[PDB]
Paper text:
We show that CdbA is a tetrameric ribbon-helix-helix DNA binding protein and changes conformation upon c-di-GMP binding. Consistently, c-di-GMP and DNA binding are mutually exclusive. In vivo CdbA is essential, while CdbB is not, and depletion of CdbA causes defects in chromosome organization and segregation resulting in defects in cell division. CdbA is abundant and binds globally to the M. xanthus chromosome.
We obtained two crystal forms of full-length CdbA-His6. The first structure (traced residues 5–52) verified that CdbA is a RHH superfamily member, with crystallographic symmetry generating a classical RHH dimer. The β-strand is terminated by P14, leading into α-helix1 (residues 16-28), followed by a loop and then α-helix2 (residues 32–48), with a strongly kinked region at A43/R44, and a C-terminal tail traceable to A52. The two α2 helices run antiparallel, with kink residues I42 and A43 packing against their counterparts in the opposing chain. Successful model building of the first form allowed us to solve the second form via molecular replacement. Upon solving this crystal form, we realized that a similar, but more loosely-packed, tetramer can be observed when considering the crystal symmetry of form one.
Residue numbers in the entry:
A (entry chain A), B (entry chain A): 5 to 52
Write the structure that this text describes.
């Protein structure tokens, strides 16, 4: 069940994401979702 | 240099991100940025 969310990126980073989106013929949202799925565990281990 | 971007997430996923943001006393944007920085390489290796 989908939900819209405005985020802030550095220029360089947004362009990096869009490059992967067009390379893979994907939405921005889908690439960022895959980044989360990959990183979740490593991030959930960050401290305080 | 910052830039605003609307993305779409599943409910569950947005809530997972916000949980890490408040746990770490961070913005949503900052957590998602860290997810990208972690996953970039693995994603840049995806195919077609």
């Amino acid at each position: 069940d989908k939900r819209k969310q405005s985020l802030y990126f550095p220029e360089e980073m947004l362009k990096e994401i869009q490059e992967e989106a067009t390379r893979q013929d994907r939405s921005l949202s889908w690439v960022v979702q895959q980044a989360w799925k990959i990183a979740r565990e490593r991030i959930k281990s960050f401290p305080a």
